[PDB]
Design a protein around this ligand. Structure first.
Ligand SMILES: NC(=O)c1ccc[n+]([C@@H]2O[C@H](COP(=O)([O-])OP(=O)(O)OC[C@H]3O[C@@H](n4cnc5c(N)ncnc54)[C@H](O)[C@@H]3O)[C@@H](O)[C@H]2O)c1
Ligand SMILES: NC(=O)c1ccc[n+]([C@@H]2O[C@H](COP(=O)([O-])OP(=O)(O)OC[C@H]3O[C@@H](n4cnc5c(N)ncnc54)[C@H](O)[C@@H]3O)[C@@H](O)[C@H]2O)c1
Ligand SMILES: O=C(O)[C@@H]1CCCCN1
Ligand SMILES: O=C(O)[C@@H]1CCCCN1
Lengths: 346, 354
């Protein structure tokens, strides 16, 4: 009958009401269970997503990401990757919204912010993969790219690993300078450090950069620690990669969405047969990751709509708890179904 | 650190006010004029057809489809219509078969700038498209309009065609007796005389016909192949699933056929049934060079309409212009734009009561 809209201010209230740590953990839990269900064949990976490339001011892409729950609802995330946004407009690079449509009737039932939600579920996905593939006594996090994702990468990982410090690099000096402030709520100290030092000293690394197509790697193939786990998070355009090939070829690599990663993720650099089990399989049967915490591992993260549906559910339950949001009659639902012009006055 | 951006939302009450303030006729005429100019632009090569739209089949309660329809104007904005075809809707839920919304995103930043009802808008630009094709392909003295399917689309087909042709009568059929029986009431505001008539009579008498039905896959045709007037123009409007068609093959093969979006029509329209050599020049071509419609008025013609996002963009602009002039709609901060672009957690709670 009406659309439930949660805006920027409701999303802020959700985070306050739940707590940043608890909210992240909720999403981590829901992702874990959902992924296991996919891994058991009980739910399906989202279909491949579509997109429109944009040249100006620098190259980006704008995408639609559907996920259907047959007989309940369709989720669609509409989201932009616009890497000039912070410097040119004071806007996040990743800018989006997430909509829910009733599957039986098509009606738009809910609409909310995609920015916070994307950051949270992306951080969560790394935590999921890192609980399986990083040493549980991991103490040093490395971060290449210290923009918006870096924050929830650090946050999420600090919740599943006993992190004591983060060594961080960004090619924009102002962005690496501000990271300690943005990270300080998590209690993990932060030290700026060049890619070679991060490689050599980190136990777990997340790369989440706006690197250009064809300009990788963002982490050099120097010595790494034997047990290093890398969450490879950066991903927008085809031809965009973050890690060096020689590193990928020696790694146990798991993808979030193998078909998508082979096209848009680090797995662009590999053939399918060289991938370990996908993330959903590992979630469904964690013992299949058994010795991999102690050897070189890569989680190839690209993002997919199921993760957004799950995260949106978490938000909606919290917002329901505290009746946040407004209700807007957006759709024209004429009482006369058959009359476009039955516009409604009582 | 720019001006705080929010989403301009026009809900059902706002679209209703636009119609009331501008007037029905004037509003439809505006849409026809903007579709006309835009199609000519595509026909001159100054703009491009929308890309193929996407969609998710649904089985239950009866077979249906939910689609996303993008159109991008580079460096300007992206339009996305999200829309359901759910044909059990009216008779199982009392909802419109076609249920949708139209959203606009800034092309430079990705920001969601506007969002409105898709229901009225879809109906208006779809009637408008048929008006465009019918001005080109119907006899300009056409007096008798046929309608097969008397649901939501039928209403704007009649309305739009009444503005471009001297329509005197509408002969109308629906396989659901309740839906054809209510049609006159819904059509009354056009002034055009309505009579219920079987498909064979509609075929025999009409100068122009619109088919706009929820016929199921494999269950066509909705108009039988039995003798029409030599000059008949048909706006073939029904379209959802592959395997859904409304016209007899035989008839299509006697007609000058023009599609709105050929690549799309060849897959999802009446041209599903046809090999590509049986299509004439597309609608955009005809709009850009009407002489290419020469002589087609006096013989059998078919406009194979499927709908495409460009039409929704243009219609949405007409609506936004009228809403801006009349101060309508609300402003909602939907997207989180943190004061620090690189800090997802730089959040702003509802300010405290003072
Ligand atoms: N895997 C997923 O699910 C997922 C989800 C969201 C975003 N992303 C992607 O993650 C990437 C980052 O997104 P974001 O929101 O943090 O954007 P952002 O602009 O806030 O952060 C990008 C940062 O990378 C830095 N950078 C660019 N090139 C670099 C290089 N060669 N070395 C080090 N730093 C470099 C920039 O200076 C900037 O600080 C994008 O590609 C985005 O599409 C992935
Ligand atoms: N081409 C476009 O741009 C465009 C735009 C919108 C909708 N559509 C399509 O137009 C069609 C109709 O949409 P609507 O909004 O009017 O749906 P509606 O449900 O409002 O009207 C459909 C009518 O068709 C009737 N019907 C079903 N089978 C029939 C038959 N064999 N003969 C006569 N009537 C029959 C139903 O009884 C119903 O009354 C759908 O296929 C829809 O997807 C096309
Ligand atoms: O899953 C996501 O939200 C992002 C959007 C941008 C490119 C792909 N990864
Ligand atoms: O163009 C449209 O709006 C419709 C939507 C439903 C099926 C396809 N045609």
């Amino acid at each position: 009958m009406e659309t439930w809209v949660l805006g920027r201010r409701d999303v802020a209230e959700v985070v306050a009401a739940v707590g940043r740590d608890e909210l992240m953990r909720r999403i981590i839990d829901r992702l874990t269970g959902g992924l296991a269900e996919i891994g058991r064949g009980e739910r399906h990976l989202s279909p491949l997503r579509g997109g429109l490339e944009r040249s100006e001011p620098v190259p980006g892409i704008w995408e639609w990401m559907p996920h259907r729950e047959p007989g309940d609802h369709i989720t669609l995330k509409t989201v932009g990757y616009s890497p000039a946004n912070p410097a040119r407009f004071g806007l996040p690079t990743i800018l989006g919204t997430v909509a829910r449509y009733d599957d039986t009737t098509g009606a738009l039932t809910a609409l909310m912010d995609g920015v916070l939600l994307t950051a949270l579920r992306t951080g969560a996905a790394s935590a999921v993969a890192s609980r399986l593939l990083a040493r549980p006594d991991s103490h040093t996090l490395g971060l290449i790219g210290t923009g918006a994702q870096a924050v929830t990468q650090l946050h999420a990982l600090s919740l599943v690993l006993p992190l004591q410090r983060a060594l961080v690099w960004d090619t924009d000096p102002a962005h690496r300078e501000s990271f300690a402030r943005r990270a300080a709520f998590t209690g993990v100290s932060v030290e700026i450090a060049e890619p070679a030092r991060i490689a050599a000293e980190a136990d777990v690394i997340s790369t989440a950069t706006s690197v250009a197509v064809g300009q990788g790697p963002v982490l050099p193939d120097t010595g790494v620690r034997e047990h290093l786990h890398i969450n490879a998070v950066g991903a927008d355009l085809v031809g965009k990669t973050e890690l060096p090939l020689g590193l990928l070829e020696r790694a146990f690599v798991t993808a979030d969405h193998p078909e998508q990663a082979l096209r848009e993720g680090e797995c662009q650099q590999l053939s399918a047969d060289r991938l370990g089990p996908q993330l959903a399989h590992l979630c469904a049967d964690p013992a299949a990751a058994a010795g991999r915490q102690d050897t070189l591992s890569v989680f190839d993260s690209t993002g997919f709509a199921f993760e957004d549906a799950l995260a949106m559910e978490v938000f909606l339950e919290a917002a329901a708890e505290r009746d946040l949001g407004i209700r807007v009659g957006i759709e024209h639902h004429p009482g006369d179904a058959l009359d476009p012009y039955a516009l409604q006055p009582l």
